[PDB]
Design a binder for this molecule. Structure first.
Ligand SMILES: O=C(O)c1ccc(Nc2nccc(Nc3ccccc3Cl)n2)cc1
Length: 264
């Protein structure tokens, strides 16, 4: 009816964010495993986000997709807000990407279809701008890809390197430039993901925030040799200063290179 903390057993922290942690967890009776997002709400006050969080769990509770991480429920005690989340066993595509250093065209094209389907679902539900950079993407039961998004950025301990430092790389020129953004932002993201999948780094990566901005806004990015032309064409068509010049989502799914190497 309404949950509370003691309905759950708590395991390790999966990741730690600035507003709180995602703990591995299971409902007490069913012994069923899930993820508990814990938000401190004191850091929520300062940061000035409560309200929109509170209609978030409204909007996200309504969403259902294979490739979207499902929000089971939510509750609060006094000092903390809890998101009851679908558990994704295999973690972040960002770790996986760190493993192999790069993906191949199967992996990529399939992830991309998986992503395109979610966003396309998302739009129909009137939900835009989902942050799909790799560290908010999780890996489900066997191979499947899940957009986590929602709550604010969580890291499993690792690396350090790029902390962020990972920010604008995925941000579209219109967003960076402080301008009204529409559904088409998410296709910019897609273009950046795809590139990173194959290359191992994002196209605009640079040692300074300024320079990164320089490259994004001016859309300056160059492929290493191995990138297939069909890859290039999709990326190129995906990353355009003009939103209107970028494909609709099904165009992506229909793309020659997508359909070729996509397991899905
Ligand atoms: O540490 C690992 O190997 C690891 C990280 C995440 C895992 N699964 C999972 N499921 C549901 C939500 C969620 N939040 C989250 C946790 C850390 C980073 C990013 C996100 Cl979205 N994470 C499993 C293992």
């Amino acid at each position: 009816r309404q949950w509370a903390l003691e309905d759950f057993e708590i395991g390790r922290p999966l990741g730690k964010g600035k507003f709180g942690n995602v703990y591995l967890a299971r409902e007490k009776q069913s012994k069923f495993i899930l993820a508990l997002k814990v938000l401190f709400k004191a850091q929520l006050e300062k940061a000035g986000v409560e309200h929109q969080l509170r209609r978030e769990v409204e909007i996200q509770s309504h969403l259902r997709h294979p490739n979207i991480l499902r929000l089971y429920g939510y509750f609060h005690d006094a000092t903390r807000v809890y998101l009851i989340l679908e558990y994704a066993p295999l973690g972040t595509v960002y770790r996986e990407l760190q493993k192999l250093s790069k993906f191949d065209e199967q992996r990529t094209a399939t992830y991309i279809t998986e992503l395109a389907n979610a966003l396309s679902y998302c739009h129909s539900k009137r939900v835009i701008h989902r942050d799909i950079k790799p560290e908010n993407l999780l890996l489900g039961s066997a191979g499947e890809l899940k957009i986590a998004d929602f709550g604010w950025s969580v890291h499993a301990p690792s690396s350090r390197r790029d902390t962020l430092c990972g920010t604008l790389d995925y941000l579209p020129p219109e967003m960076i430039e402080g301008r009204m953004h529409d559904e088409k932002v998410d296709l910019w993201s897609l273009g950046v993901l795809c590139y990173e999948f194959l290359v191992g780094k994002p196209p605009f990566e640079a040692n300074t925030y300024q320079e990164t901005y320089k490259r994004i806004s001016r859309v300056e990015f160059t492929f290493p040799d191995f990138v297939t032309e069909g890859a290039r064409d999709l990326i190129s068509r995906l990353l355009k200063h003009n939103p209107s010049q970028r494909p609709m989502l099904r165009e992506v799914l229909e793309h020659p290179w997508i359909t070729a190497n996509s397991s899905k």
